[PDB]
């Protein structure tokens, strides 16, 4: 045995009487002393002892001892002596079925907690033991065992589905299935619960007994007990995902069952049922099985979307479940509408019609939500009703009730495509006017709704906002003074999305006047390692890009923090690479946006960036990122390099030696964006190095020729590849020119399709130079070059004379009669263009 010091046990029983004192400040100082005793080891032996052995005590006092012990298992189990432990473990299991339900709960919570903290392979007597106890003839022992087993399957499902314990599932699962039949409804619900853990993992023991499982489920269809029903519903939802086949046969039966449950009095059951419709809808067989029932279903869902009376109360002054019947029904409706398209409206529209206009607001509100939910897939079918509705909704933006104001903002944003595709004055103007008001609404929910809807609307509207710009910024900037936290974040989105939507139009001193100060104000106060510098980078990145050169005043502090972060990150990635156990791996998304913002300033400020580049190790850092193993990073640096190259090649040329070989290796089209931006940045440095490029040409060229001839490459890599070749041959024709016959054809084919611009120009100068040097590359495929030259509408004159000399050079080589015959295989527009423009 173990005996406790009776003189010291009367002591503990006092503490336990004081922990139950009403007086707040007694409780305060008594608990700090019970914390104190943890320091010493035997103490926990006194607790399990008060619980399980001292029947001369108050039950609340006993249960409290076990709960205190329990909490000492959560903190401080590494500090448990293995004798205290083993006394506890054994002492729990002898009383797992105590006659007192309060004690039995307490004992049970200990067991599951010890099993959870001090893992299962360290208590391997337990499962075996708990199984054998299910069979117990004593009911309370059975229930106890099963309650524990249940929490264990919940906590430890992956470990049980593992050799760690020698596949103990193979015995228990079939064992559990037996207990679906049991007298008690509690034992029935435990059994189903345990089993449901192992459905989605496709646990072997269960997949092989699937038919027992299903027959057994089906046999509980008609159970009065919510907790049983809840668990049946969970079971059927999961099955649906993994083992569609086995229950397809019985679908209609199942479906009628779920439809009942979806309406169940008890909202737990309801919600669990509702999940069905949602996960059913993602199943390619769905569309047929269900159609018969849409009639009955739609209104069950729609009726589920009203706020309850209690929902409403918690929303006056998030304060409510992030998942509930309302969201679930509503989400189901969105998926349905994307499957059934307009086939859905006959089942909905009439409901809408009387909900939207209904006089009680809760109902009108759910009307609006529905209308929002169906928007995406019922769009076409809704067009005819919108001229009535969109104006109706613009009205409700000023409704007395905020929950009507906010959902209205949302629903309007779902029809933003249509609104923007009309006369701006009928629908868009008054919409945008009311939104802008609501952005400054007194209520936080309405702000978030309104600001988000605005940002959404802005994306669809694009350049149509330029009239209202003045009015928009007034509102957005003023909102900085109101908004905090979650709504502030939506606001940066709103401003970012604005800049992206109008671009340069936003460059005007009066606009930059009001906008920039409060942003750079916010830029500083929020701290590196803050939740919110991520949305603010992306805000400034958008703005900076739209503002162009007008950004300049403001970019020192933005540059510095960007460089800082790129470094700070690589600092950590290093450590983590060498000592991964002690060092937190970094979050690269921080770096990727910084590089993208820096790349944004390089295009934007152009040359004026230069001096900040000089003062910083931006180039070393870039060097490091180009070898980074995540492709998004390599891609964001090559992008940056090409920009820096144009903006200020003088600070770059130093590092070229080192870069070109890295660029060389990254010309691999498996990762397209990197290959693209690498191809691009060698193009751009060609032009700045000119002739001095020639040492480096051997290390890239065969791979570029590789890529352009290599099929199923996206349009705009080839375009960049062609371009870049041209730009090499422009500055080192001697080395590039001999390769001409291999790339001339896909090169022409690819660039005959792009707009007369500066890249086209610089690349075609290239081809012309190489043709002068190896005039026999083109003679095989000369019609391809004719075609590409005829793609120019209005070329620079020098370039026009270059083509002119080539075209006639050839017509003279082959003679008039050969030429005429050659050009008869030209399409009219081309033949005539060349004959008129280059005189040929």
């Amino acid at each position: 045995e173990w005996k406790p010091d009776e003189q010291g046990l009367q002591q503990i029983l006092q503490l336990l009487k004081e922990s139950q004192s009403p007086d707040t400040t007694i409780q305060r100082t008594v608990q700090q002393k019970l914390e104190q005793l943890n320091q010493y080891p035997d103490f926990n032996n006194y607790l399990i002892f008060v619980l399980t052995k001292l029947k001369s005590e108050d039950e609340p006092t006993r249960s409290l001892s076990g709960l205190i012990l329990k909490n000492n298992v959560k903190a401080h189990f590494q500090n448990f002596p293995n004798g205290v432990t083993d006394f506890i473990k054994s002492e729990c299991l002898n009383n797992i079925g105590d006659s007192s339900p309060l004690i039995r709960a307490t004992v049970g919570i200990l067991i599951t907690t010890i099993a959870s903290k001090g893992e299962l392979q360290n208590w391997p007597d337990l499962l075996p033991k708990l199984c054998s106890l299910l069979d117990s003839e004593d009911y309370n022992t059975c229930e106890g065992a099963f309650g524990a087993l249940q929490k264990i399957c919940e906590d430890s499902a992956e470990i049980l589905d593992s050799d760690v314990l020698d596949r103990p599932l193979n015995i228990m699962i079939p064992k559990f299935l037996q207990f679906f039949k049991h007298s008690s409804p509690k034992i029935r619900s435990h059994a189903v619960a345990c089993v449901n853990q192992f459905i989605i993992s496709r646990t072997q023991a269960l997949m092989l007994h699937i038919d027992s499982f299903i027959e057994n489920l089906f046999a509980l269809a008609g159970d009065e007990e919510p907790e049983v029903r809840k668990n049946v519903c969970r079971a059927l939802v999961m099955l649906l995902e993994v083992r569609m086949d086995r229950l397809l046969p019985h679908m209609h039966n199942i479906v009628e069952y779920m439809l009942q449950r979806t309406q169940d009095q008890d909202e737990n059951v309801a919600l669990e049922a509702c999940e069905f419709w949602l996960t059913l809808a993602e199943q390619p067989i769905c569309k047929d099985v269900l159609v018969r029932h849409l009639p009955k279903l739609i209104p069950v869902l729609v009726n589920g979307m009203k706020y309850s009376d209690i929902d409403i109360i918690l929303l006056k002054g998030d304060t409510i479940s992030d998942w509930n019947l309302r969201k679930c029904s509503a989400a189901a409706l969105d998926v349905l509408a994307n499957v059934y398209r307009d086939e859905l409206l006959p089942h909905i529209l009439p409901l809408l019609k009387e909900l939207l206009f209904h006089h009680e607001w809760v109902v009108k509100e759910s009307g609006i939500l529905v209308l929002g939910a169906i928007a995406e897939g019922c769009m076409q079918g809704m067009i005819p009703y919108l001229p009535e509705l969109i104006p109706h909704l613009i009205q409700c933006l000023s409704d007395k009730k905020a929950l009507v104001r906010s959902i209205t903002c949302w629903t309007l944003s779902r029809y933003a495509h249509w609104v923007v595709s009309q006369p701006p004055d009928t629908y868009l103007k008054p919409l945008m006017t009311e939104l802008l008001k609501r952005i400054l609404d007194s209520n936080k929910r309405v702000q978030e709704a309104a600001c988000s809807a605005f940002a959404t609307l802005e994306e669809e509207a694009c350049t149509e906002l330029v009239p209202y710009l003045a009015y928009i910024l007034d509102t957005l900037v003023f909102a900085f003074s109101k908004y905090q936290h979650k709504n502030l974040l939506i606001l940066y989105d709103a401003i970012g999305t604005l800049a992206d939507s109008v671009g340069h139009h936003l460059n005007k001193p009066e606009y930059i006047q009001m906008l920039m100060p409060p942003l750079i104000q916010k830029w500083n106060m929020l701290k590196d390692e803050d939740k919110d510098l991520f949305p603010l980078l992306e805000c400034l990145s958008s703005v900076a890009t739209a503002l162009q050169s007008g950004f300049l005043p403001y970019c020192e502090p933005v540059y510095q923090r960007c460089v800082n972060l790129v470094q700070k990150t690589l600092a950590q990635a290093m450590l983590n690479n060498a000592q991964p156990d002690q060092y937190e791996a970094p979050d690269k998304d921080f770096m990727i946006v910084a590089l993208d913002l820096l790349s944004g300033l390089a295009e934007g400020l152009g040359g004026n960036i230069e001096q900040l580049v000089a003062r910083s190790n931006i180039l070393t850092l870039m060097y490091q990122c180009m070898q980074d193993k995540m492709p998004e990073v390599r891609q964001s640096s090559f992008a940056l390099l090409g920009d820096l190259t144009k903006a200020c090649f003088q600070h770059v040329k130093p590092c070229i030696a080192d870069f070109m070989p890295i660029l060389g290796t990254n010309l691999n089209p498996e990762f397209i964006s990197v290959c693209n931006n690498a191809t691009w940045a060698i193009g751009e440095i060609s032009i700045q190095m000119g002739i001095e490029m020639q040492p480096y040409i051997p290390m890239v060229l065969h791979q570029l020729v590789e890529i352009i001839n290599r099929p199923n490459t996206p349009k705009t890599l080839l375009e960049n590849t062609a371009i870049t070749i041209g730009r090499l041959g422009y500055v080192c024709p001697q080395e590039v020119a001999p390769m001409l016959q291999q790339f001339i054809r896909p090169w022409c084919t690819s660039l005959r399709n792009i707009r007369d611009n500066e890249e086209k120009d610089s690349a075609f100068r290239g081809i012309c130079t190489m043709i002068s040097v190896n005039p026999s590359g083109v003679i095989q495929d000369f019609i391809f070059f004719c075609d590409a030259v005829a793609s120019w509408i209005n070329p620079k004159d020098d370039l026009r004379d270059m083509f002119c000399k080539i075209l006639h050079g050839f017509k003279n080589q082959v003679g008039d009669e050969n030429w005429r015959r050659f050009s008869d295989q030209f399409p009219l527009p081309l033949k005539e263009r060349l004959a008129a423009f280059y005189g040929v």
Partner: peptide, 7 residues
């Protein structure tokens, strides 16, 4: 990260 009553 905008308002969405379906998620």
């Amino acid at each position: 990260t905008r308002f969405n009553p379906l998620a």
